[PDB]
Design a protein around this ligand. Structure first.
Ligand SMILES: Nc1ncnc2c1ncn2[C@@H]1O[C@H](COP(=O)(O)OP(=O)(O)OP(=O)(O)O)[C@@H](O)[C@H]1O
Ligand SMILES: [Ca+2]
Ligand SMILES: [Ca+2]
Ligand SMILES: [Ca+2]
Ligand SMILES: [Ca+2]
Ligand SMILES: [Ca+2]
Length: 901
DNA sequence: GTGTAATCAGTCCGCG
DNA sequence: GCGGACTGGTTAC
């Protein structure tokens, strides 16, 4: 097989590499790698190396990496550019793996672990590690085993061995319900002292040294705790055995405010699952506890135990260990679904970077571009310092707030990457500038044509047309990958809808789900078999279809994010290819494209309707247009349609056969006007929206920019069994909005769009009467809590104290004296409730850690003093008033003459 | 740990 | 009470 790296490090003048050899074996080596860098040289000097602008370079080969680094500094002292890849491990990988890497995930040791630490005096700080580690569960992907290290004897209690038999039993048998599918995969090791536990853990680690190390909060808790605890008991040298090269760095993270300590383990790639989830999931959660995320992702119930975790080991060691094992498994289940580890390996190996560098699109693109250029013997420019400067972005149309009955939307496929490709925007393709007219003049095609030679953006930039830039070249490759995966995702989605339809008529039989590939549209034969299946089999198939869709989603959306990040990186001063001319070329072209096509669509529809000056485009954001279809429907007449699906077909056909060709003609003209390299503006229909046929539903409404709701029947070619709400920006979509309030507001919107004013009024009246019964967590607001200390003046709110910070200070006073009772953590999220006048907490609100029940000793008082009236007005009525006034609807029935009877 | 545009909640305080 | 200046936080692209 072809070799591939596992990890790479620079340690002094040595590259330390773990890799899989041609026989599939893991090996380690130390290489005295001699790096090359580059200097510009005279024209008269024969060379094969050129910088990206075509200027010749001489290669300088250094005796070692430190000599190369020292040369960089002296070049700075002289005032000359030192060219080439200054991150020598990336150069090493480029030399050692000079081919497209094919990796075998089954040979990569992926370790998933979690530790337990009993602490009678608050949260166990990893920097101090003053308490015994009393459990470790470590899952190894190569063995497919859960290794459980269990401390039976501690200063905080001596306990009995954990029983696998009890662990397997149902909760109703007194068991822990450890899933049957992992029972046979547990290797359980009890220890009568912590020293032997840790020594054996380290011997185990040596035997089965993780390549990828993951788990939940492992980077911020488990890794530093384990490292520091071993360090405290045995000394530094023993702790460094966590690194296969015995090198670690105690590395401090610097961001917005304050700092925290992480341990870099050389020769390991740590991908904390919480960080993977935050970067790759495109959710924003009210809480990031594993309980919370597991329930959301997998629909598993919260791990239930009595009393605080600080007393769980002594009171119920059996459950204590079972829950540690289950916690590790839940992360594996989340990954089975989301496939973020797979994604990281794919992207890491593609770029030829340390796998953990997938968190940095700048590092990722730096490596992609370096490897691409190196292939042609080209030499990358040196990174330079630049001042941070603001620059302009997208155009967003101001919508007239209103209901909108029938709506068809369209937007550009991969807008910014397509602009880069079309215009040929790249550091080395800059051809010069032209004299810019106001944007309006380009939009209306009255400005002088910018160039007859070069490809142009309305910001004044010109680009070469003879050859593709490296940025267009490399962005195209990842775009094509994105396109492939999105194809699979949409097929799985369409397949899902077929199953949902079939589920209206399940068969009374006993059978099996069909063995099919959900990434491809079901054949006619498959469709026929599905119509004969039982509900049980159909439901299993739907589950599998949806899992396939999720897998496609992960693969496609994060590839989209990477290519969009390249466009963004052009405007970040740390990017090697930072250039505000290029960043702005993209954004300004985008502004033109949207407004150009708005004009073209209006002109087209006025023509086919025989009107003049009528605005069919009601809204747009960045690269999208929303077109009112009322006049199109009315030209045929609502009475001519058999059912909702009939007019949906009609608009679908109209968009595909009339609008899109008109849109395409409009964009080809714009391409020619800007003299672009290649027409790549592809604005396909997104949504077909409207009320159910014959209903009093309003179909859709906008309250303002980035705030709207649509009742959608078909989304990018997916025809839904049931209409789906596309809601953007409204409170139903915000993690800050209470969960029950999101739900209630969404039902109000559903009723508005699908059923009408009377239905909305009926629901509002019920919610208002019943809502005080809702669980307090479900009606609590959510906020991130930064700078708690800044606003804390002797335990009370300082000037300009934010509402949620005020709540935290209230909480702090209320729990004063406890070494127990959860502390609010700087930077994490809190639930927030308003408090009625004259409450015993002495302020107007209280806040506590999100994803948790508020501590027992104040829970009762919070419940008693919760201000339901303020909560309702602020989170529910105020937003609903905004929705209904925009839609010209009343949420409460107004008086009428009929009341006289 | 790529980017800008945008609405909103809340504080403070003016507005005769 | 609403709005502007401001901070804080979050979402649409
Ligand atoms: N997370 C982001 N970072 C930087 N730029 C972004 C981001 N999201 C959107 N954009 C910019 O807005 C443009 C339009 O966004 P949109 O969500 O329509 O994605 P897209 O790239 O057009 O892909 P799609 O083909 O899914 O529409 C993007 O091309 C770019
Ligand atoms: Ca735990
Ligand atoms: Ca788009
Ligand atoms: Ca599309
Ligand atoms: Ca059937
Ligand atoms: Ca869009």
């Amino acid at each position: 097989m072809k070799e591939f790296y596992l990890t790479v490090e620079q340690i002094g003048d040595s590259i330390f590499e773990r890799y899989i050899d041609s026989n599939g074996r893991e090996r380690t080596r130390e290489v005295e790698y001699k790096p090359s860098l580059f200097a510009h040289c005279p024209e008269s000097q024969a060379t094969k190396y050129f910088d990206i602008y075509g200027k010749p370079c001489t290669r300088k080969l250094f005796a070692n990496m430190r000599d190369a680094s020292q040369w960089i500094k002296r070049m700075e002292d002289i005032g000359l550019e030192a060219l080439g890849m200054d991150d020598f491990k990336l150069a090493y990988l480029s030399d050692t793996y000079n081919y497209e890497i094919k990796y075998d995930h089954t040979k990569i040791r992926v370790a998933n672990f979690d530790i337990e630490v009993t602490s009678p005096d608050g949260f166990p700080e990893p920097s101090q590690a003053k308490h015994p580690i009393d459990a470790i569960t470590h899952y190894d992907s190569i063995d497919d085993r859960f290794y459980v290290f269990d401390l039976l004897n501690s200063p905080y209690g001596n306990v009995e061995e954990w029983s696998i038999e009890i662990a397997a039993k149902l909760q109703e048998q007194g068991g822990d319900e450890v899933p049957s599918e992992i029972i046979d995969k547990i290797i359980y090791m009890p220890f009568d002292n912590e020293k032997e536990l840790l020594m054996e853990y380290l011997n185990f680690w040596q035997q089965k040294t993780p390549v990828i190390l993951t788990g939940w909060n492992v980077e911020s808790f488990a890794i530093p705790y384990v490292y520091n605890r071993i360090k405290n008991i045995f000394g530094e040298s023993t702790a460094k055995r966590l690194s296969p090269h015995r090198k670690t760095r105690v590395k401090v993270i610097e961001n917005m405010y304050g700092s925290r300590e992480i341990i870099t383990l050389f020769g390991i790639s740590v991908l904390d699952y919480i960080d993977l989830y935050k970067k790759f999931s495109f959710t924003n959660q009210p809480s990031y506890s594993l309980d919370y995320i597991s329930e959301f992702e997998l629909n598993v119930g919260k791990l239930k135990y009595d009393g605080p975790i600080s007393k769980l080991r002594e009171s119920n060691h059996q459950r204590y260990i079972s829950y540690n094992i289950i916690a590790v498994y839940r992360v594996l289940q989340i990954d089975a679904k989301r496939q973020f580890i797979n994604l990281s390996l794919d992207m890491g190996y593609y770029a030829k970077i340390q796998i953990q560098s997938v968190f940095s699109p700048i590092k990722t693109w730096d490596a992609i571009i370096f490897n691409s250029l190196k292939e042609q013997n080209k030499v990358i420019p040196q990174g330079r310092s630049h001042p941070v400067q603001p620059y302009p972005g997208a155009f967003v149309k101001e919508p007239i707030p209103n209901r909108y009955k029938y709506v068809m939307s369209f937007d550009l496929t991969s807008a910014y990457p397509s602009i880069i490709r079309q215009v040929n925007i790249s550091p080395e393709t800059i051809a010069g500038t032209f004299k810019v007219a106001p944007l309006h003049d380009y939009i209306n095609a009255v400005a002088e044509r910018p160039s007859d030679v070069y490809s142009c953006s309305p910001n004044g930039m010109m680009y070469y047309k003879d050859r593709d830039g490296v940025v267009p070249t490399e962005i195209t490759k990842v775009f094509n990958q994105r396109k492939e995966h999105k194809g699979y995702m949409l097929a799985a989605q369409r397949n899902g809808e077929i199953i949902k339809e079939a589920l209206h008529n399940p068969n009374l039989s006993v059978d099996e789900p069909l063995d099919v590939d959900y990434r491809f549209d079901f054949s006619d034969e498959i469709k026929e078999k599905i119509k004969k299946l039982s509900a049980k089999s159909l439901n299993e198939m739907l589950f599998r279809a949806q899992r396939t869709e999720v897998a496609g989603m992960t693969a496609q959306i994060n590839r989209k994010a990477l290519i969009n990040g390249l466009a963004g990186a052009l405007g970040n001063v740390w990017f090697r290819y930072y250039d505000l001319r290029n960043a702005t070329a993209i954004t300004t072209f985008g502004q033109m494209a949207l407004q150009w096509i708005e004009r073209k669509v209006n002109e087209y529809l006025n023509e086919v309707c025989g009107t003049e000056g009528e605005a069919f485009v009601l809204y747009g954001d960045t690269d999208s247009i929303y077109v009112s279809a009322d006049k199109i429907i009315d030209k045929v007449g609502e009475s001519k349609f058999r059912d909702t699906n009939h007019w949906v077909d009609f608009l679908d056909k109209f968009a595909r056969e009339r609008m899109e060709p008109a849109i395409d003609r409009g964009f080809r003209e714009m391409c020619e006007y800007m003299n672009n390299k290649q027409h790549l503006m592809f604005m396909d229909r997104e949504a077909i929206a409207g009320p159910p046929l014959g209903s009093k539903g309003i179909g859709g409404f906008w309250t303002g920019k980035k705030r709207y709701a649509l009742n959608v029947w078909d989304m990018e070619g997916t025809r839904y069994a049931e209409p789906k709400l596309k809601i953007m920006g409204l409170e139903t979509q915000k993690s800050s909005t209470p969960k029950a309030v999101q739900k209630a507001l969404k039902e109000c919107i559903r009723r508005m769009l699908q059923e009408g004013e009377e239905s909305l009024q009926e629901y509002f009246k019920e919610f208002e009467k019943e809502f005080r019964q809702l669980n307090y967590i479900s009606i609590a607001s959510v906020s991130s809590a930064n700078n708690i200390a800044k606003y804390d003046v002797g335990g009370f709110p300082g000037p300009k104290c934010p509402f949620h910070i005020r709540g935290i200070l209230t909480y702090n006073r209320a729990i004063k004296g406890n070494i127990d009772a959860p502390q609010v953590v700087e930077g994490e999220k809190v639930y927030v409730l308003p408090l009625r006048e004259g409450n015993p907490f002495g302020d107007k609100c209280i806040a506590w850690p999100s994803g948790t029940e508020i501590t027992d000793l104040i829970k009762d008082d919070v419940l008693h003093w919760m201000d339901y009236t303020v909560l309702l007005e602020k989170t529910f009525i105020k937003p609903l008033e905004g929705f209904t006034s925009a839609a010209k609807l009343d949420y409460e029935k107004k008086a009428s003459l009929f009341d006289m009877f």
